[PDB]
């Protein structure tokens, strides 16, 4: 596969990692506490 000066392989890969990192970071949700009783 060719490389391009429009967007290089390194840049493209890096942009892929950024999108994934952001999505997985923003996919975390905190529970306020235990969801069952008793503990």
């Amino acid at each position: 596969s060719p490389d391009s000066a429009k967007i290089s392989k390194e840049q493209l890969k890096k942009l892929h990692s950024n999108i994934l990192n952001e999505i997985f970071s923003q996919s975390q949700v905190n529970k306020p506490g235990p969801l069952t009783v008793p503990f």
Binding site: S1, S4, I7, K9, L12, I19
Partner: protein, 67 residues
């Protein structure tokens, strides 16, 4: 310059899209059939716009630029 992006998963469902990417969601059918090189890269194009593909972790990234 980057004219758009689409990210999509192995079922062909979109994860995100921007620029011309949002106008070309139908491209995914063809794009998802592209066989990537040993490092996960490919370049294809339907028209005047060049699609740069990279796939890792079951997610394909397509960015649109000119050719």
């Amino acid at each position: 310059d980057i004219k758009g992006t689409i990210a999509f998963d192995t079922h062909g469902n979109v994860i995100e899209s921007t620029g011309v990417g949002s106008q070309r969601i139908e491209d995914i059918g063809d794009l998802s059939k592209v066989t990537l090189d040993a490092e996960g890269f490919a370049q294809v194009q339907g028209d005047s716009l060049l699609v740069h593909l990279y796939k890792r972790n079951d997610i394909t990234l397509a960015v649109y630029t000119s050719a």
